[PDB]
Design a binder for this molecule. Structure first.
Ligand SMILES: Cc1cc2nc3c(=O)[nH]c(=O)nc-3n(C[C@H](O)[C@H](O)[C@H](O)COP(=O)(O)OP(=O)(O)OC[C@H]3O[C@@H](n4cnc5c(N)ncnc54)[C@H](O)[C@@H]3O)c2cc1C
Ligand code: HEM
Ligand code: HEM
Ligand code: HEM
Ligand code: HEM
Ligand SMILES: O=C([O-])[C@H](O)C=C([O-])O
Ligand code: NA
Length: 568
């Protein structure tokens, strides 16, 4: 049996999986995944029969309901989605090796017979607002437009929701929240603004930064008002004080936030379509938006008529070819991103007239795990970890900006470095348990034994932590002037995580204004068209601050949905 339907036909009828006419229910395959779940159980039930002590195909962090068909296709062999980032030992029946090859918008130019026919038919739906992309900005935008009295359709090209947003760890920057108040933090949006602007090297558009800071408490108040926990306020690089909010005790902010937005779209019955890619923004004869053409992976091309289209497609940090064109020094680096973060959403924007900006500014996250090929939150350093090179020495202020840390780390022997911390640090940030669980955190009861495990000079490293630890006690890092030295590393065992920069965020993208309206090369608004989140440029300038993109997607997402819903 060469495929799963074949294998199942053997002892079962076509309509155990299909509807009575046999047509696919929709591009989310709702009816058809329901059939799967009626015989094999829900996702959790199936993981119960798939256990492995360190991994489970049917488990993970992905928020929302994760279709069986995200990995099991019926009439063809298919791929395990977790192979886009991991290499877990898998035995998927009817597997084929992960390979993402998605046509670019320009390639889809070849489909002009199908596209023309779709366009000559009537709209498949007629609504007020179409929001493209189910990451943080997309959900927020759908929600705020629904709540502003707009009818929404939310489309996601992947099989699963959440984009890069569901991967977020260290936190959401907000200032002068009650959450920093209760933790005895003192900040102003002026300070969040001035951290931002200096962090971006003054490249940032000041009015967008001004919206980011001025609305950040409100954005956190919004999410909390909706079901989120963002009471743990941690430090991140280039911030003056702590302001990265995440759930109580340091757990990842991303999966959680995407799971609160998701329940909030569901509570409101928001029409959410998976395996549905936004292809072309359509315009009327006075150049304002009139709808969008989309490509359903399962039912084909079709268009939706609407007054406003919200592009919330995220960045292009998975696309190294486009990154390497813009920054040749990144060419070849591994990315931290989900597999579809390739910038098609930008092409859609440009094709509609939107002009791009700040596109050559691409952030590399300083600490991707050499071993796991996954990002290790910067909150590990904010909660007190240091970095050491192979000589067992510190070489950089670990809570500096990302450009600078990345550069420092690449200049170290073997082009990588090590996060080193103890149980005090581990205990303060539950996410670390996740890296310990992934196996990327070697551990030992002394620094000589850890250095010996890991190839770092043992006595040097020992002497390094003891100087660090006196520096913590005496409150001033006179070696690298790290301004926040929150913990001595002297409680319980020790751990090391081998780290090196990976491609992580594109700070450039479509030009938007304070209302989240896309503009053109002459700086004119494109009536009906908005942009929110990593798809935009102007917010983070030359260097984004850890913590700011999540605050960015919530604030621009939310404002775009209200601007779009009022626009109509
Ligand atoms: C590993 C990791 C951890 C991070 N941790 C943090 C953190 O702690 N704090 C922080 O501030 N930032 C963090 N960042 C950055 C932040 O999560 C991203 O900047 C944010 O996800 C941008 O959100 P968005 O809504 O703009 O896009 P995304 O969340 O990336 O979502 C965009 C969605 O659009 C879909 N889409 C794309 N093109 C189309 C199309 N044509 N049609 C339909 N759908 C489309 C994409 O598939 C995706 O699902 C992290 C990023 C990564 C990769
Ligand atoms: C797309 C829909 C479905 C998917 C992805 C799915 C998943 C799977 C997979 C991956 C296998 C193993 C294949 C192999 O071992 O070679 C399997 C076997 C099996 N499936 Fe399906 N399933 C689906 C729908 C159904 C339905 C509708 C039924 C019953 C009417 C069903 C009942 C079974 C049974 C009975 C087995 C064999 C062993 C057992 O569980 O007793 N499944 N299924
Ligand atoms: C001989 C029996 C079957 C026939 C004739 C049949 C018919 C079809 C057709 C024509 C399609 C493509 C639809 C389109 O492109 O519009 C399709 C896809 C699909 N079918 Fe079947 N079906 C059969 C059995 C099954 C079985 C046994 C399963 C699951 C175990 C299943 C689940 C699905 C799903 C989930 C899809 C979407 C695409 C995919 O995963 O390949 N069908 N089927
Ligand atoms: C309710 C949802 C799903 C159902 C009903 C389903 C069905 C199944 C079944 C019945 C098996 C065989 C395991 C056994 O017989 O013990 C299996 C294996 C597998 N499925 Fe699923 N699956 C679903 C969701 C997913 C998803 C979302 C993914 C990928 C992210 C996935 C990837 C795999 C893999 C990789 C294996 C092989 C297991 C291993 O080597 O540990 N499945 N699936
Ligand atoms: C069903 C799909 C997947 C499964 C079951 C899975 C499994 C895991 C496991 C077992 C760990 C170790 C920690 C833990 O216990 O949670 C982990 C961590 C991690 N995985 Fe995955 N993985 C999946 C897909 C992905 C994808 C597609 C990405 C990137 C787009 C990714 C990125 C990461 C990252 C960044 C971590 C580090 C810990 C954290 O940030 O919470 N994973 N995952
Ligand atoms: O290190 C993180 O958790 C993270 O990746 C944070 C941001 O802002 O990009
Ligand atoms: Na951007």
């Amino acid at each position: 049996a060469d495929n799963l339907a074949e294998f199942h036909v053997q002892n079962q009828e076509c309509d155990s999986c299909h509807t009575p006419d046999g047509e696919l229910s929709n591009d989310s395959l709702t009816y058809e995944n329901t059939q799967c779940v009626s015989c094999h159980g829900t996702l959790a039930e199936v993981a119960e029969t798939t256990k492995h002590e360190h991994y489970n195909a049917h488990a993970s962090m992905f928020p929302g309901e994760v279709a069986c068909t995200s990995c099991h296709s019926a009439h063809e062999k298919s791929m395990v989605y977790c192979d886009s980032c991991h290499s877990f030992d898998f035995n998927m029946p009817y597997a084929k090796k992960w390979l993402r090859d998605e046509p670019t918008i320009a390639e889809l130019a070849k489909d002009k017979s199908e596209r023309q026919a779709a366009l000559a038919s009537a709209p498949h739906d007629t609504v007020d607002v179409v929001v493209v992309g189910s990451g943080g900005a997309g959900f927020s935008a759908a929600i705020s437009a629904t709540d502003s009295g707009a009818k929404v359709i939310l489309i996601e090209k992947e099989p699963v929701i959440g984009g890069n947003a569901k991967l977020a760890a260290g936190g959401m920057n907000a200032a002068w929240t009650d959450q920093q108040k209760a933790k005895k933090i003192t900040d102003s949006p002026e300070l969040m603004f001035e951290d931002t602007m200096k962090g971006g090297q003054n490249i940032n558009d000041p009015a967008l930064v001004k919206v980011l800071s001025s609305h950040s408490k409100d954005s956190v108040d919004w999410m909390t008002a909706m079901g989120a926990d963002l009471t743990d306020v941690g430090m991140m690089g280039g911030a003056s004080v702590n302001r990265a909010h995440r759930p109580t005790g340091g757990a990842g902010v991303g999966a959680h936030v995407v799971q609160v937005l998701y329940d909030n779209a569901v509570k409101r019955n928001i029409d959410l379509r998976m395996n549905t890619r936004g292809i072309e923004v359509l315009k009327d004869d006075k150049g304002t938006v009139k709808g969008i053409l989309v490509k359903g992976m399962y039912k084909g091309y079709y268009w939706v008529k609407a007054d406003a289209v919200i592009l919330a497609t995220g960045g292009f940090a998975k696309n190294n070819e486009r990154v390497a064109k813009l920054d040749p020094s990144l060419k070849g680096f591994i990315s931290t991103n989900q597999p579809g973060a390739v910038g098609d959403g930008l092409d859609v924007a440009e094709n509609a007239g939107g002009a791009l900006k700040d596109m050559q500014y691409i952030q590399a996250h300083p600490t991707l795990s050499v071993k796991g090929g996954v990002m290790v939150t910067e909150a590990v350093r904010g909660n007190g970890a240091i970095l050491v090179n192979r000589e067992g020495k510190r070489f950089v202020n670990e809570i500096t900006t990302r450009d600078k840390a990345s550069a420092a780390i690449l200049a170290q022997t073997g082009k990588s470095a090590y996060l080193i911390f103890d149980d005090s640090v581990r205990k303060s940030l539950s996410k670390i348990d996740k890296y310990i669980g992934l196996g990327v955190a070697p551990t030992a009861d002394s620094l000589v034994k850890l250095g010996k495990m890991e190839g770092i000079d043992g006595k040097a490293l020992t002497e390094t932590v003891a100087r660090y630890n006196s520096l913590v006690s005496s409150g001033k890092d006179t070696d690298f002037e790290r301004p926040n030295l929150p913990r001595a590393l002297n409680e319980g065992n020790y751990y090391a995580i081998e780290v090196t920069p990976g491609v992580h965020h594109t700070m450039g993208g479509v030009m938007i204004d304070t209302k989240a309206e896309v503009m053109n090369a002459k700086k004119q608004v494109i009536p009906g068209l908005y942009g929110a989140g990593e798809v935009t440029g102007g917010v983070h300038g030359a260097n984004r601050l850890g913590g700011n993109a999540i605050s960015d997607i919530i604030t621009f997402g939310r404002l775009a949905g209200e601007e779009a819903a009022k626009y109509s």
